[PDB]
Amino acid sequence: PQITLWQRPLVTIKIGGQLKEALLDTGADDTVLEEMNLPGRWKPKMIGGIGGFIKVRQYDQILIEICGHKAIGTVLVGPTPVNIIGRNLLTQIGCTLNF
Amino acid sequence: PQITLWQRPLVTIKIGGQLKEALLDTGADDTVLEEMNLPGRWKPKMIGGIGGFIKVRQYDQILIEICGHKAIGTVLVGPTPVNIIGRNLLTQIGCTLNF
Ligand SMILES: CC(C)CN(C[C@@H](O)[C@H](Cc1cc(F)cc(F)c1)NC(=O)O[C@H]1[C@H]2CO[C@H]3OC[C@@H]1[C@H]3C2)S(=O)(=O)c1ccc2nc(NC(C)C)oc2c1
């Protein structure tokens, strides 16, 4: 699809057998999801944003369906206020900005 | 232009007579710039993001040139780690996501 930006660019994702909404976020390098149950091993990480830093769990080679498109990559899980799809996954679904 | 997302979507802006780089950020509702000298009245505001909240100065009807396109709107100035162009200005320059 083409998505205009009059409203937040929210999409449906499926990850770890669960359905969620997430924000298509060109300002995010990495993908950050709110606390959820994901299987397997993970590595501690801290990431920074507008108000300071959070500790996240890093999960690698995680399958995610983003608006009907499949991608595999790194997902960070932790206290983000909103689920964020970052450029690591936006590049895999062929997402571009146009003006 | 069309912009792919293999690198951060940085653009040149001109604001308050000054040249800066800023991130085209679909995950940002509002436009947040690092401390800079802007003329005129402003209103205190606090905004939230991944790591907590910052206090910003809100400036209204501010002219900004974003990659050659002119827009007028609200700009928040404060301790953001990076200059962010949010949807309030992305809608004015006709910016869309496509996949
Ligand atoms: C500051 C930006 C450069 C990076 N951020 C992405 C930005 O799009 C971020 C996404 C976001 C986070 C959040 F907690 C709540 C939201 F509603 C929206 N937006 C953001 O700070 O915007 C703030 C401000 C903008 O106006 C309004 O719209 C949303 C609120 C609010 C104030 S980030 O902090 O969430 C972020 C996300 C993914 C990242 N991956 C990394 N990876 C490496 C570099 C560590 O860093 C990340 C940093």
**Quick one: chain A helix, strand, coil %, rounded to 5?**
5, 55, 40
Give the closest of A53, A93, A96 to B2, CB-based: A96
- Which residue(s) pair with A72 in the sheet? A63
What is the distance in angstroms between the CA of the first residue and the CA of the last residue of chain A?
15
Amino acid letter for position B67: C
Query: Which among A5, A87, A94 is the nearest to B87, CB-wise?
Result: A5
Cβ–Cβ contact A25 with B under 8 A: yes
Encoding tokens for residue B42? Answer: 């402003």
Technique used to solve these coordinates: X-ray
**Declared resolution, Å:** 1.5
Tokens for A12?
């449906």
Cα–Cα distance between B75 and B22 in angstroms, integer?
12
What is the domain extent for residue B12?
Answer: 1-99
Q: Which residue is listed with tokens 């944003």?
A: A49
CA B48–ligand 1 middle distance (angstroms):
9
What lies within 8 Å, CB to CB, of A68 at 6+ separation is none
User: Which neighbouring-strand residues pair with B71?
Assistant: B64
Any idea what DSSP says for residue A9? -
Place of tokens 């005129």: B40
Question: Which of A26, A80, A84 has the CB atom closest to B5's CB atom?
Answer: A26
What is the residue type of A7? Q
For residue A3, CA distances in Å to A8, B33, B58, B65 come to 10, 25, 28, 23
* CB-ligand 1 contact for B86 (6 Å cutoff): yes
A20 and A33 Cβ atoms separated by less than 8 Å: yes
Does A45 contact chain B (CB < 8 Å)? no
Q: Ligand 1 centroid vs B85 CA: distance in angstroms? A: 12
Give chain B's domain count. 1
Helix (H, G, I), strand (E, B) or coil at B87: helix
Helix ranges, chain B (H): 87-90
Strands B18-24 and A96-98: unpaired
Structure tokens at A89: 């996954």
Please provide residue A89's backbone torsions phi and psi, each rounded to the nearest 5 degrees: -100, -30
Nearest CA among B92, B56, B94 for reference residue B71: B92
- Contact flag B6-A91 (C-beta cutoff 8 Å): yes
**A84 at interface of B, judged by CB pairs closer than 8 A:** yes
Write down the residue that tokens 């802007």 correspond to.
Answer: B38
Phi, psi of A40, deg, nearest 5: 100, -170
**Joined tokens for residue B97:** 């996501």
Burial class (CB in 10 A: 0-12, 13-18, 19+), A31: buried
Chain A environment of B53 (Cβ under 8 Å): 51
Tokens 């293999």 correspond to B6
Structure tokens at A78: 């932790």
Between CA A3 and CA A18 the distance in angstroms is 24
The amino acid occupying position B78 is G
What is the nearest CA distance from A11 to chain B, expressed in angstroms? 12
B7 burial (CB, 10 Å; 0-12 / 13-18 / 19+) is exposed
The residue whose two tokens read 């909404």 is A21
Structure tokens, A19: 């359905």
C-alpha to C-alpha distance for B41 and B30, rounded to whole angstroms: 18
CATH number (domain holding residue A78): 2.40.70.10
Length in residues, chain A: 99
* CB B43, CB B64: distance < 8 Å: no
